[PDB]
């Protein structure tokens, strides 16, 4: 299924090295990805709940 | 911390 | 709603510093994230089609 979560991306620590990516660039970009994971999960939960309610109304 | 960037700044 | 995409993640360029996050480790992490974006979209698309079909039955 899904490999990561918003929490795992928040708490991920990368090791450092010479000529590594600037931390500010990477962390601001991953913060947008974190908001997306939250958006994705909320939409899925909304749809799974609608799916369940539609099913119940059919039977 | 609620964001990576806020943790990075504080550190 | 959603800010990024598989293609926006691939296209993203990061500045480098004298030191920074190890590029190999960041990229391999982004590769998993790209795979998750695909999985989210497929899951959402399946659910939308199913709810549409169910809504037609009512
Ligand atoms: Mg600290």
Residue numbers in the entry:
A (entry chain B): 5 to 63
B (entry chain D): 5 to 15
C (entry chain A): 5 to 62
Quote what the paper states about this structure.
GpsB has emerged as a major regulator of PG biosynthesis in low G+C Gram-positive bacteria, and its homologues (DivIVA/Wag31/antigen 84) in Actinobacteria play essential roles in hyphal growth and branching. To gain molecular understanding of GpsB function, we report three crystal structures of PBP cytoplasmic mini-domains in complex with GpsB, the first structures of a PG synthase in complex with a cytoplasmic cell cycle regulator. The PG synthase arginine finger pokes into a negatively charged cavity situated between α-helices 1 and 2 of GpsB and is fixed in the same orientation in all structures, just as the phosphoryl group defines the binding orientation of peptides to 14-3-345. Therefore, the role of GpsB in the bacterial cell cycle is that of an adaptor, docking PG synthases to other cell wall enzymes, scaffolds and shape determinants into protein complexes for division (the divisome) and peripheral growth (the elongasome).
